[PDB]
Amino acid sequence: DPLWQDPCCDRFPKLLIIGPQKTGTTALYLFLGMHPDLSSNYPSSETFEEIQFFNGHNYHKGIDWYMEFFPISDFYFEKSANYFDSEVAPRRAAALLPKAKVLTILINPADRAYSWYQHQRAHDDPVALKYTFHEVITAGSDASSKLRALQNRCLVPGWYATHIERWLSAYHANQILVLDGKLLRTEPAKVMDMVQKFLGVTNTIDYHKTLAFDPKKGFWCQLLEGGKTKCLGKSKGRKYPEMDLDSRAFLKDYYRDHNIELSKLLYKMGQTLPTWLREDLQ
Numbered sequence: 431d432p433l434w435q436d437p438c439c440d441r442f443p444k445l446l447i448i449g450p451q452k453t454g455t456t457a458l459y460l461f462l463g464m465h466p467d468l469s470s471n472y473p474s475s476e477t478f479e480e481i482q483f484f485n486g487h488n489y490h491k492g493i494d495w496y497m498e499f500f501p502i503s504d505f506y507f508e509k510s511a512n513y514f515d516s517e518v519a520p521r522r523a524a525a526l527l528p529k530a531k532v533l534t535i536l537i538n539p540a541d542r543a544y545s546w547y548q549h550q551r552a553h554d555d556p557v558a559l560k561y562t563f564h565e566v567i568t569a570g571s572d573a574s575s576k577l578r579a580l581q582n583r584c585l586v587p588g589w590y591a592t593h594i595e596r597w598l599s600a601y602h603a604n605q606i607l608v609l610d611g612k613l614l615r616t617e618p619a620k621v622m623d624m625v626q627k628f629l630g631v632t633n634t635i636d637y638h639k640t641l642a643f644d645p646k647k648g649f650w651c652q653l654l655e656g657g658k659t660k661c662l663g664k665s666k667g668r669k670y671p672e673m674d675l676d677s678r679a680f681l682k683d684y685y686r687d688h689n690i691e692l693s694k695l696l697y698k699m700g701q702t703l704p705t706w707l708r709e710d711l712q
């Protein structure tokens with residue numbers, strides 16, 4: 431395992447959206463790319479919009495492998511929801527891009543866990559298709575290894591504070607931005623504003639004016655000519671049943687403490703507490 435150091439250049443991302451998954455990363459990624467001054471990486475035929483360099487096996491491929499993803503607009507960014515959870519990504523990223531901006535998006539952990547479950551079912555994951563949500567989150571003494579594994583993938587990434595500390599040890603607080611996932615989905619133009627301000631955007635664009643709520647889609651989309659909308663794909667904003675109330679409550683109890691710690695950490699980081707977080711904490 432190596433540790434690519436800062437080569438200095440201009441062909442490197444200046445912002446990293448580390449996830450986690452199912453928090454609205456693709457939407458932030460899509461809306462940000464709309465700003466004429468900000469440019470995303472080119473898609474991978476294996477990981478699509480994501481690069482996934484710092485997290486796992488792709489990192490030992492070298493710096494040039496990474497640089498190729500970016501154009502040769504003068505501010506690039508990449509998104510890999512796998513970075514948030516990654517243990518090694520923080521220091522590996524800090525070593526190569528010490529001055530990079532780090533952005534993360536948080537939604538209620540319970541819904542984030544539910545979305546992952548629904549996500550694995552959509553991709554026809556057998557363990558996810560075989561067990562119900564409650565069975566996954568309460569997987570126990572009679573639970574299989576695969577079932578247990580799916581539970582970890584639903585719940586662990588939701589220990590927001592734990593992972594944010596790993597990134598906070600590799601990056602200064604003023605180089606990190608914790609977004610409200612609920613606000614991004616409910617009022618995207620509001621967070622698109624905080625992001626721009628956070629990136630030091632010279633010519634701020636108003637998204638209120640050129641985004642729009644698509645009722646048949648149930649989410650915001652890009653406003654085009656004459657009412658028209660360009661929304662995210664079918665795999666984004668999947669149509670499934672509201673999560674069980676008992677399951678919700680069960681998870682509410684489980685994260686209570688994680689959420690207490692998060693509230694303290696963010697405050698200490700100088701980040702505004704997410705709406706969903708204030709409610710859960712009351």
Ligand SMILES: Nc1ncnc2c1ncn2[C@@H]1O[C@H](COP(=O)(O)O)[C@@H](OP(=O)(O)O)[C@H]1O
Pocket residue numbers: 450451452453454455456457511544545546548614615649650651662665666667668669
């Ligand atoms: N404008 C938007 N259009 C579509 N989905 C959006 C959205 N803003 C937020 N989302 C949310 O972001 C999730 C996907 O996140 P990610 O890109 O990190 O995997 C969605 O999955 P759901 O399909 O479970 O509702 C959805 O709730």
